[PDB]
Amino acid sequence: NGLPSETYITCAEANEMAKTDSAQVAEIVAVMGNASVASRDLKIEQSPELSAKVVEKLNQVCAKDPQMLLITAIDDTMRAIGKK
Amino acid sequence: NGLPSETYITCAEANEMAKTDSAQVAEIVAVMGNASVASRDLKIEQSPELSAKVVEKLNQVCAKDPQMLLITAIDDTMRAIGKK
């Protein structure tokens, strides 16, 4: 919880900023996401489309429960795609 | 040299595309960039300040060498960071 404001931000609210700054929102989500999911296989193809997905479905989950911080929310995707 | 167009595109020309799509470009460079550099230490965090950085100076290096493919270009950046 003692993380920088950007990292401690909620994924749902990340969409709010996305209209102004899609870059910093989609980047961190993708950059962390891919690196953190590579932890279980290490061959997660680096392609804009996959990232585009991680902020689409993830924010959808956030819409269901706002108690998910951006940092933890994407971690649930790590386990979702992390089914090896 | 037989890789898909986008990943076979030079860092210099990738910046050109960023003018139309800053996302796909800043993403892929930070995505694999951070993933590859973290493969040497894993002490490297993910921040929006890094994408801008890895696509800034690199495009300048590739401005001196248009032959530098995106993949190779980022490798050279890893070398710089891996220099400890």
mmCIF file of C-alpha atoms in Angstrom:
data_model
loop_
_atom_site.group_PDB
_atom_site.id
_atom_site.type_symbol
_atom_site.label_atom_id
_atom_site.label_comp_id
_atom_site.label_asym_id
_atom_site.label_seq_id
_atom_site.Cartn_x
_atom_site.Cartn_y
_atom_site.Cartn_z
ATOM 1 C CA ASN A 1 0.000 0.000 0.000
ATOM 2 C CA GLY A 2 3.020 2.223 0.509
ATOM 3 C CA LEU A 3 3.607 2.443 -3.206
ATOM 4 C CA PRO A 4 3.866 5.502 -5.515
ATOM 5 C CA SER A 5 0.513 7.155 -6.313
ATOM 6 C CA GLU A 6 0.622 5.857 -9.900
ATOM 7 C CA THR A 7 1.291 2.261 -8.825
ATOM 8 C CA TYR A 8 -1.171 2.488 -5.925
ATOM 9 C CA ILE A 9 -3.890 3.709 -8.287
ATOM 10 C CA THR A 10 -6.951 1.594 -9.040
ATOM 11 C CA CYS A 11 -7.273 -0.115 -12.410
ATOM 12 C CA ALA A 12 -10.791 1.286 -12.869
ATOM 13 C CA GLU A 13 -9.504 4.820 -12.311
ATOM 14 C CA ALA A 14 -6.645 4.023 -14.678
ATOM 15 C CA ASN A 15 -9.286 4.077 -17.402
ATOM 16 C CA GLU A 16 -10.240 7.565 -16.262
ATOM 17 C CA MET A 17 -6.673 8.758 -16.902
ATOM 18 C CA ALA A 18 -6.404 6.600 -20.057
ATOM 19 C CA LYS A 19 -8.519 9.137 -21.972
ATOM 20 C CA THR A 20 -5.894 11.729 -21.206
ATOM 21 C CA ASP A 21 -2.857 9.466 -21.076
ATOM 22 C CA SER A 22 -3.432 6.021 -22.579
ATOM 23 C CA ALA A 23 0.348 5.560 -22.747
ATOM 24 C CA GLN A 24 1.303 5.625 -19.048
ATOM 25 C CA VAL A 25 -1.781 3.572 -18.212
ATOM 26 C CA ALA A 26 -1.456 0.836 -20.801
ATOM 27 C CA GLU A 27 2.320 0.782 -20.549
ATOM 28 C CA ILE A 28 2.715 -0.006 -16.846
ATOM 29 C CA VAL A 29 -0.134 -2.537 -17.063
ATOM 30 C CA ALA A 30 1.529 -4.267 -20.040
ATOM 31 C CA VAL A 31 5.181 -3.815 -19.095
ATOM 32 C CA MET A 32 4.610 -5.244 -15.586
ATOM 33 C CA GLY A 33 2.056 -7.734 -16.820
ATOM 34 C CA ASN A 34 4.238 -9.365 -19.456
ATOM 35 C CA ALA A 35 7.319 -9.427 -17.217
ATOM 36 C CA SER A 36 5.367 -10.845 -14.313
ATOM 37 C CA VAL A 37 3.642 -13.529 -16.412
ATOM 38 C CA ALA A 38 6.960 -14.467 -18.032
ATOM 39 C CA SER A 39 7.817 -15.588 -14.538
ATOM 40 C CA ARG A 40 5.957 -18.867 -15.161
ATOM 41 C CA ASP A 41 7.073 -19.658 -18.714
ATOM 42 C CA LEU A 42 9.337 -16.835 -19.914
ATOM 43 C CA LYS A 43 8.116 -16.993 -23.541
ATOM 44 C CA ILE A 44 5.201 -14.561 -23.355
ATOM 45 C CA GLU A 45 5.258 -13.014 -26.868
ATOM 46 C CA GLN A 46 5.744 -9.257 -26.809
ATOM 47 C CA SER A 47 2.934 -8.016 -29.014
ATOM 48 C CA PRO A 48 0.778 -4.805 -28.635
ATOM 49 C CA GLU A 49 -2.394 -6.862 -29.056
ATOM 50 C CA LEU A 50 -1.816 -9.026 -25.966
ATOM 51 C CA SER A 51 -1.237 -5.910 -23.917
ATOM 52 C CA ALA A 52 -4.349 -4.283 -25.402
ATOM 53 C CA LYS A 53 -6.172 -7.328 -23.941
ATOM 54 C CA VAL A 54 -4.671 -7.134 -20.417
ATOM 55 C CA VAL A 55 -6.172 -3.651 -19.877
ATOM 56 C CA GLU A 56 -9.520 -4.509 -21.490
ATOM 57 C CA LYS A 57 -10.500 -7.593 -19.532
ATOM 58 C CA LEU A 58 -8.706 -6.511 -16.364
ATOM 59 C CA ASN A 59 -10.575 -3.175 -16.150
ATOM 60 C CA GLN A 60 -13.701 -5.235 -16.749
ATOM 61 C CA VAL A 61 -12.953 -7.210 -13.603
ATOM 62 C CA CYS A 62 -12.265 -3.936 -11.751
ATOM 63 C CA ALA A 63 -15.712 -2.716 -12.819
ATOM 64 C CA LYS A 64 -17.007 -5.708 -10.838
ATOM 65 C CA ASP A 65 -14.995 -4.886 -7.702
ATOM 66 C CA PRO A 66 -13.236 -1.496 -7.210
ATOM 67 C CA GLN A 67 -11.227 -2.796 -4.214
ATOM 68 C CA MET A 68 -8.664 -4.023 -6.722
ATOM 69 C CA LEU A 69 -5.582 -1.809 -6.984
ATOM 70 C CA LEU A 70 -3.880 -1.711 -10.396
ATOM 71 C CA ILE A 71 -0.811 -3.434 -8.976
ATOM 72 C CA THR A 72 -2.813 -6.331 -7.463
ATOM 73 C CA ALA A 73 -5.540 -6.492 -10.131
ATOM 74 C CA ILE A 74 -3.097 -7.403 -12.928
ATOM 75 C CA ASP A 75 -1.622 -10.016 -10.593
ATOM 76 C CA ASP A 76 -4.928 -11.875 -10.919
ATOM 77 C CA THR A 77 -4.312 -12.003 -14.639
ATOM 78 C CA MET A 78 -0.867 -13.492 -13.918
ATOM 79 C CA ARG A 79 -2.691 -16.467 -12.410
ATOM 80 C CA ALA A 80 -5.458 -16.466 -15.055
ATOM 81 C CA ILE A 81 -3.041 -16.806 -17.996
ATOM 82 C CA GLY A 82 -0.607 -18.391 -15.606
ATOM 83 C CA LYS A 83 -2.453 -21.682 -15.875
ATOM 84 C CA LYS A 84 0.432 -23.767 -17.113
ATOM 85 C CA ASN B 1 15.702 -11.039 -40.685
ATOM 86 C CA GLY B 2 12.621 -13.136 -41.280
ATOM 87 C CA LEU B 3 10.629 -11.825 -38.357
ATOM 88 C CA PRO B 4 7.131 -10.233 -38.677
ATOM 89 C CA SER B 5 7.154 -6.718 -40.155
ATOM 90 C CA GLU B 6 6.567 -4.772 -36.919
ATOM 91 C CA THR B 7 9.325 -6.532 -34.955
ATOM 92 C CA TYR B 8 11.541 -6.471 -38.042
ATOM 93 C CA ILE B 9 11.146 -2.707 -38.212
ATOM 94 C CA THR B 10 13.951 -0.423 -37.133
ATOM 95 C CA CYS B 11 13.768 1.650 -33.972
ATOM 96 C CA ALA B 12 14.027 4.801 -36.087
ATOM 97 C CA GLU B 13 11.036 3.784 -38.241
ATOM 98 C CA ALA B 14 9.212 2.575 -35.111
ATOM 99 C CA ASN B 15 9.275 6.124 -33.816
ATOM 100 C CA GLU B 16 7.666 7.204 -37.058
ATOM 101 C CA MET B 17 4.754 4.856 -36.326
ATOM 102 C CA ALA B 18 4.592 6.133 -32.705
ATOM 103 C CA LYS B 19 3.570 9.462 -34.254
ATOM 104 C CA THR B 20 0.367 7.725 -35.207
ATOM 105 C CA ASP B 21 0.458 5.117 -32.447
ATOM 106 C CA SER B 22 2.620 5.986 -29.475
ATOM 107 C CA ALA B 23 1.121 3.018 -27.602
ATOM 108 C CA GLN B 24 2.177 0.012 -29.733
ATOM 109 C CA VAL B 25 5.677 1.462 -29.983
ATOM 110 C CA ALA B 26 6.336 2.622 -26.418
ATOM 111 C CA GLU B 27 4.799 -0.610 -25.248
ATOM 112 C CA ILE B 28 6.837 -3.131 -27.208
ATOM 113 C CA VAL B 29 10.059 -1.310 -26.421
ATOM 114 C CA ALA B 30 9.361 -1.193 -22.684
ATOM 115 C CA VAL B 31 7.704 -4.595 -22.644
ATOM 116 C CA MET B 32 10.654 -6.551 -24.043
ATOM 117 C CA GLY B 33 13.094 -3.909 -22.886
ATOM 118 C CA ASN B 34 12.239 -4.207 -19.214
ATOM 119 C CA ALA B 35 11.754 -7.971 -19.603
ATOM 120 C CA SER B 36 15.165 -8.411 -21.154
ATOM 121 C CA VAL B 37 17.061 -6.029 -18.827
ATOM 122 C CA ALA B 38 15.335 -7.548 -15.804
ATOM 123 C CA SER B 39 16.685 -10.853 -17.029
ATOM 124 C CA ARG B 40 20.084 -9.711 -15.788
ATOM 125 C CA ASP B 41 19.071 -8.404 -12.347
ATOM 126 C CA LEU B 42 15.253 -8.354 -11.860
ATOM 127 C CA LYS B 43 15.892 -5.254 -9.719
ATOM 128 C CA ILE B 44 14.569 -3.035 -12.469
ATOM 129 C CA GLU B 45 11.065 -1.654 -11.853
ATOM 130 C CA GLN B 46 8.396 -0.632 -14.341
ATOM 131 C CA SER B 47 7.554 3.044 -14.644
ATOM 132 C CA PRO B 48 6.090 5.283 -17.471
ATOM 133 C CA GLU B 49 9.326 7.214 -17.276
ATOM 134 C CA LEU B 50 11.229 4.224 -18.634
ATOM 135 C CA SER B 51 9.297 3.805 -21.883
ATOM 136 C CA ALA B 52 9.872 7.430 -22.864
ATOM 137 C CA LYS B 53 13.537 6.899 -21.978
ATOM 138 C CA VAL B 54 14.126 3.603 -23.857
ATOM 139 C CA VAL B 55 12.423 5.033 -26.971
ATOM 140 C CA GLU B 56 14.107 8.439 -26.678
ATOM 141 C CA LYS B 57 17.827 7.743 -26.703
ATOM 142 C CA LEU B 58 17.468 4.578 -28.731
ATOM 143 C CA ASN B 59 15.780 6.485 -31.594
ATOM 144 C CA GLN B 60 18.802 8.775 -31.433
ATOM 145 C CA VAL B 61 21.232 5.867 -31.705
ATOM 146 C CA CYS B 62 19.156 4.484 -34.592
ATOM 147 C CA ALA B 63 19.275 7.985 -36.043
ATOM 148 C CA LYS B 64 22.994 7.409 -36.464
ATOM 149 C CA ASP B 65 22.394 3.890 -37.773
ATOM 150 C CA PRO B 66 19.080 3.331 -39.632
ATOM 151 C CA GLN B 67 20.089 -0.319 -40.117
ATOM 152 C CA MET B 68 19.425 -0.997 -36.416
ATOM 153 C CA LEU B 69 16.418 -3.310 -36.121
ATOM 154 C CA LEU B 70 14.118 -2.758 -33.105
ATOM 155 C CA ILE B 71 15.141 -6.053 -31.473
ATOM 156 C CA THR B 72 18.880 -5.475 -31.903
ATOM 157 C CA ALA B 73 18.553 -1.821 -30.877
ATOM 158 C CA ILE B 74 17.034 -2.727 -27.494
ATOM 159 C CA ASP B 75 19.827 -5.306 -26.976
ATOM 160 C CA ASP B 76 22.357 -2.468 -27.210
ATOM 161 C CA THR B 77 20.425 -0.618 -24.530
ATOM 162 C CA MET B 78 20.604 -3.680 -22.283
ATOM 163 C CA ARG B 79 24.374 -3.617 -22.747
ATOM 164 C CA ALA B 80 24.472 -0.045 -21.478
ATOM 165 C CA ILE B 81 22.346 -0.877 -18.422
ATOM 166 C CA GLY B 82 24.136 -4.200 -17.953
ATOM 167 C CA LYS B 83 27.282 -2.155 -17.617
ATOM 168 C CA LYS B 84 27.882 -2.236 -13.887
#
